[PDB]
Design a protein around this ligand. Structure first.
Ligand SMILES: Nc1ncnc2c1ncn2[C@@H]1O[C@H](CSCC[C@H](N)C(=O)O)[C@@H](O)[C@H]1O
Ligand SMILES: Nc1ncnc2c1ncn2[C@@H]1O[C@H](CSCC[C@H](N)C(=O)O)[C@@H](O)[C@H]1O
Ligand SMILES: N[C@@H](Cc1nc[nH]c1S)C(=O)O
Lengths: 245, 247
């Protein structure tokens, strides 16, 4: 009897574990791979995948880190990651034409990360109010999270407390700020300030983070999300890499 | 207001899609469709063509390079105004979206495109594909790209359109079949649904059931297109073209 995910969870199962579309590398694999590259001078004892959704990037980080915590606001996402981790498979509904669907099974043993999955622990939790035990990380990776937060500065201005000195914070975002998710006054960029000048999100990130971090690198990373049998979202996130001073 | 296609944001989105730069190696969709349509209709007289759901008018201008007269019809007055402004004033401006609320101003210059040799052969009209006025008839080609999945009742259009096409003329549809209740009540979707007997209905099959009364299906092909939303976010979609010859 395979655990079956709902429609919201199915979308992220498809995104994180489905076959690559339009020749684009799997996003979680691309992000975890780069993070491992950028943190090559760290001991790689502890990583945090914050906003881990159905957990693919946590599994991928665990191939290099001794221990990886994956945390997500959504209990349903965490349940799906945990079921794949413990029982080895989960089922989901891939979007098709109209209301039509294609049922798919994700088999843990079909991925290279099968050699490391016991090094991950998944938790429900909130990036803006993490419990104190989530600390002493060599790496905190938060991919496509900041423009889903109502007040992203609440996460960003405190996160240095959970990272070891010379450890890394790695963010990605396509900077698609929207009032449905984030109050305009809390957008990190993508707005015209009171003086008429355009504020870029990377500039806003520097202003928040350069108190405790140095900006080491930026890189563009595409991803593709399936909406129907024929319609897809093709987006380019910017990765920014920050080293604790 | 209520119609998303009447908003300035949709006008700017379709200006960029129809007249702007290619993305991800995907060629301009209006030109691809018009070029393929001219190929499929090579043996017809090429006197009159209708571009139904023409949005900001690019495919109408491109059809007019080969047809003696082209009518572009859209339900959105804002789209019709934009196409007419480009046609008559020779330029229109629009906004590209960046991060968040940021925008960049761009200009479309009529004289920068090859279709500039034919733009007086187009007439643009506001109109309803599901209930066209009688004067829109006697077409050698009717091309309706990405239209059917935005119609309130697609059968009003599909069951009647053969009456507006000359004998041996063509109807050429494209659609990605993005059926949504915001555009079309589910009872009127041509496909993408499970019927009352539990069978899955594909849109192309639903199209065959309706159109094979008066048409022969001549060809299908897949055509990708890309719509920029922001400088970092895009729709990337595979439309299905179907080519129908009136019997
Ligand atoms: N306050 C919060 N704390 C933690 N996770 C949150 C959160 N608000 C949203 N999330 C989660 O963050 C994710 C945003 S979507 C990005 C998911 C994944 N990291 C990827 O890059 O594809 C979702 O899984 C969402 O449930
Ligand atoms: N009943 C109707 N009659 C005419 N046009 C309609 C319509 N319902 C929707 N439309 C138009 O159909 C278009 C859908 S998007 C497709 C636009 C263009 N043909 C392209 O291929 O890119 C919009 O321009 C919309 O205004
Ligand atoms: N998403 C675009 C393109 C489109 N047209 C028809 N279907 C689809 S998707 C729109 O809604 O106009």
């Amino acid at each position: 009897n395979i655990y079956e995910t709902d429609e919201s969870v199915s979308q992220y199962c498809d995104f994180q574990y489905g076959e690559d579309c339009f020749g684009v590398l799997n996003f979680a694999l691309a992000c975890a791979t780069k993070a491992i590259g950028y943190t090559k001078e760290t001991p790689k004892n502890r990583a945090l995948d914050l906003g881990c959704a159905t957990g693919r990037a946590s599994f991928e980080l665990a191939r290099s880190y001794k221990h990886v915590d994956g945390v997500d606001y959504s209990q349903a996402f965490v349940d799906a990651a945990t079921e794949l981790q413990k029982n080895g498979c989960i089922g989901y509904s891939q979007n098709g034409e109209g209301e039509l669907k294609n049922y798919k099974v994700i088999d843990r043993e079909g991925y290279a990360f099968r050699d490391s999955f016991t090094k991950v622990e998944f938790f429900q939790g909130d990036a803006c109010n993490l419990t104190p035990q989530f600390k002493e990380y060599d790496l905190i990776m938060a991919t496509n999270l900041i423009d889903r937060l109502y007040e992203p500065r609440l996460f960003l201005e405190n996160i240095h407390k959970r990272i070891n000195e010379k450890g890394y914070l790695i963010l990605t975002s396509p900077y698609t700020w929207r009032e449905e998710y984030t109050a305009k006054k809390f957008w990190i960029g993508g707005y015209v300030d009171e003086n008429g000048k355009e504020v870029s999100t990377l500039e806003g990130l520097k202003e928040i983070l350069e108190i405790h971090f140095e900006l080491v690198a930026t890189e563009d990373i595409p991803f593709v999300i399936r909406e129907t049998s024929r319609k897809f979202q093709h987006t380019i996130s910017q990765m920014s890499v920050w080293k604790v001073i």
